[PDB]
Amino acid sequence: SKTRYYLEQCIPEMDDLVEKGLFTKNEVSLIMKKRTDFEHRLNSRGSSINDYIKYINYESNVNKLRAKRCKRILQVKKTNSLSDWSIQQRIGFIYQRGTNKFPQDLKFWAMYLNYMKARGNQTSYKKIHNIYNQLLKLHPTNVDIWISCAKYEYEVHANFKSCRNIFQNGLRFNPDVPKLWYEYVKFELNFITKLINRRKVMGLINALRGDIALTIFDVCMKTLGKHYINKHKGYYAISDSKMNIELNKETLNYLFSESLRYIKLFDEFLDLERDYLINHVLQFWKNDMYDLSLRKDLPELYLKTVMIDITLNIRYMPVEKLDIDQLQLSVKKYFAYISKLDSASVKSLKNEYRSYLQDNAEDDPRYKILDLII
């Protein structure tokens, strides 16, 4: 039997752990009968990931007791013998066995990754790379594993090339969830922000732009639109032109709501050229979307983008020097909108007035602003 093999693999560490005079024979027999129970429950039939988890918790508890007893008996913090790594190696092998048997519970896979990362200097980052590789092989569609893999290899190791490779491979696998798109534009903005801040720092002590984020923004719009028109209206295109235009309108609503979220969490990256990097998404949304977002319905979205293009310089604090510089730009925007619109004219006028009043002695310059926007 293989429980016999594993149990007698456990004996040299307790040889060493009895020789180093911290445990006695009668208590190490007790930890062996508990470990016998656990090994038999592991490699018998009807096994459970809770059996694996309880074995890992028991082995961590006897490791903590071993460390406590070592500090109290020998008054060293490690005996530099077999019995201080064998038990963590055992926990790692219980994790490997469990993930080979039940490779379906991401709770257990993430407990494996957490213990392997928190093992510290003693583990190897290529050993973490191996279990990231096989986990991403088994779950390519689950996207938080791609985010966690790239987050470990950028926010700990700062490996930009491999992080870009992870994000491009994940976007190859599931180019359908917008969350991976948003985390990729987030990673690219974080990388370019660290690039220009190390430039600023080398200047203060002693070309490559957000156009990467704009290009992945562009392919984000194109492929998310393609995958929504392929996901809905699923089997066939058996739908008349009313249902086809209803579908295409709804995909425009979907994609434009995601770009609204993109600008909403795009504004807080204010260390690069945030005006240019928001204005390029503005000009990428301003063009035609093949179903007349401006010249027909989604006119509310056209008014939303017009309000964004108006306040895109007026994204400011109550110190309104930019307003005193270019509020005539907002007035010309309201005039150019009300020169064409019918109820969106009154809506945009009242909305820009309410927005400027809410956002903006100090009340006397604000009395000038109220007389301006009255």
């Binding site: 208590e27 007790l30 930890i31 508990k34 028991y58 508890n61 006897v62 903590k64 007791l65 406590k68 007893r69 109290r72 008996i73």
Partner: protein, 32 residues
């Protein structure tokens, strides 16, 4: 080599010690 309370707590976990269990079964005396 003194004892320790945290050491004896997780030692009672690791060695599977029902000594406090039998102490509580003998102690609780149906007090309510």
């Amino acid at each position: 080599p003194p004892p320790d309370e945290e050491e004896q707590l997780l030692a009672k976990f690791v060695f599977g010690d029902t000594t406090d269990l039998q102490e509580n079964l003998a102690k609780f005396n149906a007090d309510f």
